[PDB]
Design a protein around this ligand. Structure first.
Ligand SMILES: Nc1ncnc2c1ncn2[C@@H]1O[C@H](COP(=O)(O)O)[C@@H](O)[C@H]1O
Lengths: 104, 316, 139
């Protein structure tokens, strides 16, 4: 693939998207709906199941869905610190790699 | 007749534990899914303290975003250094307050403390080898480190603790029950040169004993030698949180009021107790040491996790 | 067995024994209470703007941070296949725009490897931190 620093014309020139609308013949004109795997209720229950095993010894340890691996996880900024994460594979195990970094 | 049977069953249990340790890797100790909290080195020290307390942890690997490499482990030792520096330089409150994690090395230089060549283990290696290395850590934590398959960079996988190894052993080796020889007959308890203090001793003096003695805790006794409480390296975290400038000349007894209500307590045993019972307690609760007392409650010694590991690995 | 918890080590007994003696610190010094708030985690970042507007903000942020990207086709307009300079030197990312509700969109960020089972996301996490901050300023 060829790489450039030129912003695609569809996001800087109204003519491009207009041309798409008028030269009709459907879903590609709109961003896809969010997959159920990336929903925030499933993500936090995954966290809560990890917590329930380690605080109350209740149930079993949660294996994450393979879809969400290497995707960025975020939280609200608190105390001018950004906390981000990503669930990655280490051999046959899963490490939620969390980073705390100061912001401005 | 009876002491011959106890002895051989102890031997069988130990040989069994050692084989387990020789057959497992550090990788095996890891949960199938777990979290790794890492701090950017430009983060403030006092915020890093809050991160640790909020997450119920006492250590965190550091990451240098400039050089894209790991920069060691933040531990209670780093926080000891800070309090010691501030106590010696109480005019530098502003520097300490605004201190960033990457400024810790300047504090170390100012105090004259050794670099500390902190160990690491490759997860694939036998657990037994990680155990041997654990006898050298005074923190009790060693980073699990592998190589990134694309960048060849050295990268942190997890942090292994002595508690976690001994709990992993206990959970998987129920043969611990047959460790029936009283710890008094094993010669594993440290009894000579016990570093201790009293309730009226200033906390800063107790903190000096932690690094000067290379110990994780200081038993607190009365005039007649009765064990009353303990001061741990862990307690230092709450001590900085509740005002450093405030507790300059505070007694250990007074500083101990800062302890959270969820503090789980100091564990005690006697010379007649068995490692079977000890491992049962480790199996069910986070115990970092057992202080040995006599029949009336006077301190006679201490049995730490490193003493137990050393017995498992090396024997009496 | 004779394994016990030393009663005087427990905070409630220690406090009471210090109070009974008479020391002032017993009244004034209170135990540490660390309120651990239940952090809500989300994948990526949410935006209230509309598709073309959002994609425009991202590309602008990408350009000022010194990233390069592939020319998208009509079947993948809402996908950015980018490369970032930061041994392999160029980090690859895939950014995807999703629709949640009518007025609500999610920006998804995915690490895609390097170009010249065991890996660190921390260089990826660090760069996304820059990207999120660049975007937050322009808003
Ligand atoms: N307060 C203390 N005084 C003397 N020895 C200790 C003390 N605390 C621990 N030890 C011993 O020092 C070694 C390392 O201690 P630790 O780092 O707590 O495992 C072990 O063999 C302990 O038995």
């Amino acid at each position: 693939m060829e790489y450039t620093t030129d912003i695609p014309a569809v996001f800087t020139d109204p003519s491009v998207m207009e041309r798409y609308y008028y030269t009709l013949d459907t879903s590609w004109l709109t961003p896809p709906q969010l997959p159920p795997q990336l929903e925030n209720v499933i993500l936090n229950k995954y966290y809560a199941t990890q917590d329930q095993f380690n605080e109350n010894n209740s149930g079993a340890l949660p294996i994450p869905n393979h879809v969400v691996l290497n995707h960025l996880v975020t939280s609200s900024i608190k105390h001018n610190t950004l906390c981000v994460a990503s669930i990655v594979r280490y051999k046959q195990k899963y490490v939620t790699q969390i980073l705390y970094t100061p912001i401005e | 007749d009876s002491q011959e049977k106890v002895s051989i069953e102890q031997q069988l249990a130990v040989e069994s534990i050692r084989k387990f340790l020789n057959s497992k890797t550090s990788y095996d100790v890891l949960p199938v899914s777990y979290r790794l909290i890492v701090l950017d080195t430009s983060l403030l020290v006092k915020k890093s303290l809050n991160v640790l307390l909020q997450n119920s942890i006492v250590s965190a690997p550091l990451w240098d975003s400039k050089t894209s490499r790991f920069a060691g482990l933040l531990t209670t030792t780093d926080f000891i250094n800070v309090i010691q520096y501030y106590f010696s330089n109480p005019d530098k409150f502003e520097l300490v307050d605004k201190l960033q994690l990457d400024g810790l090395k300047d504090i170390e230089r100012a105090l004259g403390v050794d670099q500390l060549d902190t160990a690491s283990i490759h997860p694939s290696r036998p657990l037994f080898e990680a155990c041997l290395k654990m006898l050298e850590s005074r923190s009790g934590r060693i980073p699990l480190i592998d190589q990134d398959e694309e960048t060849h960079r050295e990268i942190v996988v997890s942090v292994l603790t002595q508690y976690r190894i001994l709990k992993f052993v206990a959970l998987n080796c129920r043969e611990t029950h047959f460790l029936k020889i009283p710890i008094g007959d094993l010669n594993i308890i440290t009894q000579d040169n016990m570093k201790s203090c009293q309730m009226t001793t200033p906390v800063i003096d107790v903190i000096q004993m932690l690094t000067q003695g290379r110990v994780s805790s200081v038993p607190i006794i009365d005039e007649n030698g009765y064990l009353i409480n303990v001061y741990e390296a862990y307690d230092v975290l709450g001590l900085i949180k509740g005002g450093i400038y405030n507790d300059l000349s505070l007694s250990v007894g007074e500083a101990l009021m800062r302890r959270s209500d969820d503090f789980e307590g100091v564990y005690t045993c006697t010379k007649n107790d068995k490692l079977s019972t000890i491992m049962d307690n480790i199996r069910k609760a986070r115990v970092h040491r057992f202080f040995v007392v006599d029949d009336v409650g006077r301190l006679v010694g201490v049995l730490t996790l490193s003493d137990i590991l050393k017995y498992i690995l090396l024997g009496s | 067995s004779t394994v016990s918890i030393l009663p005087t080590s427990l905070p409630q007994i220690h406090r009471a024994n210090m109070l009974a003696q008479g020391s002032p610190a017993a009244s004034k010094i209170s135990p540490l209470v660390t309120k651990k708030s239940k952090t809500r985690w989300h994948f990526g970042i949410r935006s209230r703007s509309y598709p073309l507007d959002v994609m425009g903000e991202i590309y602008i942020a990408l350009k000022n941070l010194g990233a390069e990207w592939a020319k998208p086709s009509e079947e993948d307009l809402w996908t950015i296949k980018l490369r970032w300079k930061y041994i392999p030197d160029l980090m690859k990312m895939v950014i995807q725009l999703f629709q949640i509700e009518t007025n609500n969109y999610l920006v998804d960020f995915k690490f895609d490897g390097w170009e010249s089972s065991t890996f660190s996301a921390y260089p990826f996490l660090h760069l996304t931190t820059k990207l999120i901050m660049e975007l937050a300023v322009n808003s």
